[PDB]
Amino acid sequence: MISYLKKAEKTPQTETATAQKVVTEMLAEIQARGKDAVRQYAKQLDGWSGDIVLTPDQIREQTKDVPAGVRADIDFAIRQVTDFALAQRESLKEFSVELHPGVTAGQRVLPVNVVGCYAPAGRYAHIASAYMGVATAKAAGVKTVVACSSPFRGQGIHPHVLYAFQAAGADVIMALGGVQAIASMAYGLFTGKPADVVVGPGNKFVAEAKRSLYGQVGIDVFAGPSEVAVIADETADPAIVASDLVGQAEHGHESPAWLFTTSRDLADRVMALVPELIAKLPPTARDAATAAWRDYGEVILCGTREEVVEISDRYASEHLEVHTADLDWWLANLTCYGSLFLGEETTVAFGDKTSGPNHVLPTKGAARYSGGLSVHKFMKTLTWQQMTREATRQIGQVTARISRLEGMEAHARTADDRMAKYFPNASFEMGTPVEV
Amino acid sequence: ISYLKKAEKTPQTETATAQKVVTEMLAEIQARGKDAVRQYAKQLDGWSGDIVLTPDQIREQTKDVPAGVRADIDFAIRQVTDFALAQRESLKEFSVELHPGVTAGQRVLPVNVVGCYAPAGRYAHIASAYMGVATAKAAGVKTVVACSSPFRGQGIHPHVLYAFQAAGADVIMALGGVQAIASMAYGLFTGKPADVVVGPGNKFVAEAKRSLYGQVGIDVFAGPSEVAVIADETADPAIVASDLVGQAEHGHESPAWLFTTSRDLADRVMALVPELIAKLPPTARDAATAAWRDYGEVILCGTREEVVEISDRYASEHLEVHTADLDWWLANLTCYGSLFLGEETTVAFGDKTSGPNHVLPTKGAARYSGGLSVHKFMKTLTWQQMTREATRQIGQVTARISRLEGMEAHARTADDRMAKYFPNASFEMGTPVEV
Ligand SMILES: NC(=O)C1=CN([C@@H]2O[C@H](COP(=O)(O)OP(=O)(O)OC[C@H]3O[C@@H](n4cnc5c(N)ncnc54)[C@H](O)[C@@H]3O)[C@@H](O)[C@H]2O)C=CC1
Ligand SMILES: NC(=O)C1=CN([C@@H]2O[C@H](COP(=O)(O)OP(=O)(O)OC[C@H]3O[C@@H](n4cnc5c(N)ncnc54)[C@H](O)[C@@H]3O)[C@@H](O)[C@H]2O)C=CC1
Ligand SMILES: N[C@@H](CS(=O)(=O)O)C(=O)O
Ligand SMILES: N[C@@H](CS(=O)(=O)O)C(=O)O
Ligand SMILES: [Zn+2]
Ligand SMILES: [Zn+2]
């Protein structure tokens, strides 16, 4: 038996209907009206009536005052993300194999042509998100990267976001936010370069827009309001656990922070500390985190490690920290999470900004079926095959027979035609011809 | 570049029709659950019986499937499995050191539950039944649920059923169409919602899967079958024409495309295709006549490079190459579902028994994905671990960037570690955020 010491009124699912209604209306307008609707939304939602595509010269002008120390930090983080991305790239190989004798089959691994990357800017300016998308796309060998971020605080793109996009290798940069940005990248509005894949994190509207546009484009994953889970035993430090939960709760009113523990004492101290830490935050963060903890935060006490694994796997958190003994066991036994942080020393914020692994990660249970943005999301794994004539003796008769069982005579005739051309003297059973 | 035959319709033509039906049906199933599904099954497919088949039913319904049939299906399952296991070996786990003391790695883990759909309407898709289930089993998925439409006012086609059973399905349901995809996504009738739903189908099936993405993962948008052939002057028109017709019989919406550098070849094929269609039995003849007329296209190009450009833009589900210098085509083509190099292999071989999966992207989805494979059932997740020493650099960069973004609570998680691990250290952690 599992005890909820803190139960949330709301979950990542609560706001689904609200997001869907807005996105349905906006995507309909943009499909009908194109750039006209996008310019309208940019003005009405973001107060923006400037040009949307930045020229190379505006990019230089807008970043000319970014200090050396800020550039050095962003450059370091880009290098870490690139290093890990290149290691991930090496993990997926091309190959060919012989199947039935004379049947050669293989796998080609090819980057997509055009990627659109979104970096959010609303409550905060997402400098790290800006290099997470673009640097990964460049590591994957994508030749055209289009990047968008929302106009921020009465100006255009945040200068540090813009520096990140430029340093990471973006080919085209647009001052454009939200659903209208996602849609513009999917349809190639303003650039004439429709994306093959659109990636990047955002609020519930951004995430729903990407989900809805799937099919028009590929995507990385459903990457909506941030979530954090911590697994802790009696070895954990409640002050650090509480700090880590509050860390992601500041993202917004809808960010869940989950604690799964085998220690009642830990649970109690964390529940006492989280409100105290929230109260010491500055206004924007305090507003977000107070609501998020109240409405979405949960604390679950479990009897055994196996019970913790079961609940953790069901929650399928974007981020999972593990502050326990015997970390090898947790790495071996946990199966549903976006990104795993083993031990107290690393933490979600480190992964968010500069550890290396991508931060763009599944939310709302998408970790049941996908990991996060990676080079893998920009590669197509395509198959090819080639046969000797000899291989077609077996392959062809099996194809003709199965085809005819299914009722597909024209399929069987492509096998009959090869058998008659290559082996006119053979007499295999090719199945009773279909008559209806 | 010149169109010798231009289609009135494309894969895009019927999108609105599909989306309207799917939106209505999903809204109804979300409201009324199993009852909505049982009603759709009755009205659409004539079905009143039990939806979940019992083991006794499965055995009873397959008891007369002959040895010769079983041997062919078993052979095809082996080829699909062999290629799937090769694909599974191509994606590895690893760990690496980044900044000194930072370890990061990739875990590759199968999903828990897969739902597989095998179509049955115009034809009964025996091969489709093992393409999904066998691949899921090769990936190490523990629970596989399989559905196929009640066929012609009776139950699941017995050979589709045999295929599901022999390929390793854990649960089999007699359920078709949108109501099948929805039932597997939501775990109706089994209590086991799928993590990933896969499999091909008509425009309604494919749209239902596209719509339910998010609730579940999917393989790919896999709608009405498409075929493209690239041919030069060395190609045999009789075989090209045959191959086009072969997939045209799938239904009235199936495009058959010919890209060639030889006007002679194009002309002979355009004469032959109608003649071959005319010789088909009634159901196929009806499908292929409409498909070729409405969706068939023939494009003449001046250079190989032009062919590549056009082929890549069409991004066909299946692409056959009947040319000299096949190495060049393998090296230069980039958008297709599955490639058939040389005259000897052909799409129907891939459909039934070559090995590589036939469940493939249509309507331009080959621009961003390959087909169903074990890779669609594996999650690639990341993990990391650090020494305390590593956090001196990582932590100060985190704190500074966080504060530049306006994220003070993020920075405090770094400040807290620095104060705990290195209480005498003094770093630039960034100006605290005040708004
Ligand atoms: N899953 C992941 O990996 C990550 C998720 N995130 C999440 O990204 C989110 C960022 O959210 P925001 O600050 O809002 O930035 P955002 O860039 O996602 O959204 C700002 C844009 O949304 C539009 N918008 C806002 N409310 C709207 C409404 N009612 N109707 C239509 N458009 C509307 C704005 O006008 C603007 O164009 C946070 O929830 C954060 O946790 C952040 C990083 C990574
Ligand atoms: N992309 C790929 O890899 C593959 C594609 N396919 C395609 O699969 C398709 C199979 O189509 P079908 O024979 O129809 O079998 P299906 O199993 O896809 O469709 C039959 C189901 O659809 C329902 N349905 C039919 N019309 C409907 C309507 N108007 N409204 C609501 N429900 C409706 C039926 O009642 C039944 O439940 C073909 O187009 C074939 O080319 C087949 C194999 C692989
Ligand atoms: N924690 C965010 C990343 S960031 O803090 O916005 O950089 C996420 O959900 O990945
Ligand atoms: N040609 C079908 C496969 S099958 O002929 O239905 O077996 C496809 O589109 O993949
Ligand atoms: Zn964060
Ligand atoms: Zn076929």
Curated annotation (Swiss-Prot), chain A:
Keywords: Metal-binding, NAD, Oxidoreductase, Plasmid, Zinc. Binds 1 zinc ion per subunit. Its EC number is 1.1.1.308. Pfam families: Histidinol_dh. SUPFAM superfamilies: ALDH-like (SSF53720). It catalyses: (2R)-3-sulfopropanediol + 2 NAD(+) + H2O = (2R)-3-sulfolactate + 2 NADH + 3 H(+). GO terms for cellular component: cytosol. It is an enzyme of class 1 (oxidoreductase). Optimum pH is 9-10. Zn(2+) binds at Q248, H251, D352, H411. NAD(+) binds at Y118, Q180, N203. The active site is at E318, H319. Its cofactor is Zn(2+). GO terms for molecular function: histidinol dehydrogenase activity; NAD binding; zinc ion binding. InterPro entries: Ald_DH/histidinol_DH, Histidinol_DH_CS, Histidinol_DH_monofunct, Hstdl_DH, Sulfopropanediol_dehydrog_HpsN. The keyword Endoplasmic reticulum does not apply. It comes from the Bacteria. One of its GO terms (biological process) is L-histidine biosynthetic process. Catalyzes the NAD-dependent oxidation of (R)-2,3-dihydroxypropane-1-sulfonate to (R)-3-sulfolactate. Belongs to the histidinol dehydrogenase family. HpsN subfamily. This is Sulfopropanediol 3-dehydrogenase. The gene is hpsN.
